[PDB]
């Protein structure tokens, strides 16, 4: 019923459904306090599941909690490094290193389970690296100006890898089914999200209390409802496919949306940018073949 | 003489010519390019005849008609490459020059059959990555038509030569003599059609001293002349094109060690990326032998 390439279509739809909700349904999703919006998003996911539990799928522990706590902490730290990385580094460049993380994750999966990287798989990762670089090569955007941004990207790559890798390990160890992975991420996320909000954001009743009104709160539940899509499908994808497949599909997801921006809109375009897009598609096609050749072998 | 010996040889004769063109001969950016190559090949032919009568090689009529397309592929290869570079920056010219290694490699499958390893393709992507990064680390349309034409005449040249070499059991020396001899007439046809010949002007431009430079350039080109046909023969049309583009890197790393010119992190990256590419290529050859 739920295994194989079906999960990939879900993560994509829920990413696309979530991409569209933040840029159209929610006008200006560039909030003042990012960690509190995510705390609501995870609270919507939490409330949602308990209602579904009393109409039917998930469990609550003390041993699984002590083993899942690092995953949620990596998750939240993963977002914290990604936010601080993007304050100083332009998105196309951020994508470069975010596509380069696919390579260490792939070789990170070798050191966790054993599935060696096929020669054909590596060509894909080089193609996704190529694709972004050509896409940046087609774009615009003190000594210590570059400097802070590259530190935060290095730490995001390692928490992005340790997050998807160590989650997948504890999933297959405790036979977590999709719903438990979803429940344990959003619930154990609430506490680490609140610690990250108080540590990084400024809480002032005279100022920031007025900034989140009746209308913006409506935005966070709308966004939390959208985030129910991707929340379930990330842990489903990583479970049935791999930590590297999830990393690749996530990198691929951005392309059709960017290609949508090329079809559905009359904004100026670049050959180098249009190239990067089909280079990225060339990347995914080479990857899927790499998968068929691996499966038929053993 | 076979194996990785040809590869070290091609490197030495390239490195020697790079130094000779950049040190011994002051300003080799001459007025008439195909006339310099005609002397360069004129020196290479003379050298072979003296060597034959001291020892070598053969001279035919059937082989000439089959080697003639290879020579024309060469002279046109230079012509498009000159015309490519009139409109395109060197770093980009190299991007496309590296992209030809891919079609040359898949060109060998359609010419001989030895399929492209998945690991071999990674090396070619790494070489493309490297150059794109080297271009991304720099400053500076009709040139693109001529690059599309330099790429195909570079591939048809390297493939058909390696094909006719293996077809007529040409040895290194026969390949050297046939290339240098049959280029002479096609070089002169190309100079007369493209360069401006004026006694009142350009006859003064090639003096006794510049003529001395073209002969110094000719002695240097004997090295790379022998090793190109030796390398393509004992290794491959693809290994030749990889060794050729990889050669540019130690010269680039040389300029960074031996000179105080400005450098960029992107530049140093591209070089070590190119080195990683050679290493990956070296292994894919090892694994290709062990599997097949
Ligand atoms: C601003 C940044 C610009 C960034 C520009 C991109 C840099 C790409 C560098 C390296 C390739 C990635 C590592 C590839 C590792 C080599 C392959 C390898 O390990 O091959 C043996 C393998 O086990 C056989 O399958
Ligand atoms: C403006 C310039 C546009 C060009 C830019 C494109 C850059 C990517 C290059 C080549 C893709 C190669 C496609 C062919 C992939 C075949 C894979 C292969 O040969 O695999 C080995 C085989 O399975 C063993 O049996
Ligand atoms: N697995 C997992 N990933 C999440 C969760 N919520 C959001 N994501 C992350 O959200 C990103 C895609 O979300 P987007 O901003 O496009 O809606 C991915 O990096 C994905 O890992 C969650 O609870 N679990």
Author numbering:
A (entry chain E): 18 to 73, 77 to 161, 177 to 333
B (entry chain A): 19 to 73, 77 to 161, 182 to 333
What text comes from the article?
To understand how GMP is recognised by Vrg4 we determined a co-crystal structure with GMP at 3.3 Å resolution. Vrg4 adopts a very similar pose as that for the GDP-mannose transporter (root mean square deviation ~0.47 Å between 276 Cα atoms), with the binding site open to the luminal side of the Golgi membrane and sealed shut on the cytoplasmic side through the packing together of TM6 & TM7 against TM8 and TM9. Clear mFo-DFc difference electron density was observed for the GMP ligand in three of the eight transporters in the unit cell. Unexpectedly the three GMP ligands adopt slightly different positions within the three binding sites, despite a r.m.s.d of only 0.45 Å between the three structures. In chain C, the phosphate group of the GMP molecule forms a salt bridge with a conserved lysine (K289) on TM9 and interacts with a conserved tyrosine on TM1 (Y28) through a hydrogen bond. Unlike the position of the GMP ligand in chains C and D, the molecule adopts a bent configuration, with the phosphate group now orientated towards the luminal entrance of the binding site. In this position the phosphate now interacts with a conserved serine on TM1 (S32), rather than K289, which adopts a different rotamer configuration compared to chains C and D. However, unlike the GDP-mannose ligand, GMP does not make a direct interaction to the conserved asparagines of the FYNN motif, which are ~4.5 Å away. Analysis of the apo, GMP and GDP-mannose bound structures of Vrg4 show the presence of well−ordered monoolein lipid molecules at a potential dimer interface. Our findings that GMP adopts several similar, yet discrete conformations in the binding site now provides evidence that the slower rate of transport observed for GMP vs. GDP-mannose is due to less effective coupling between the ligand and the transporter.
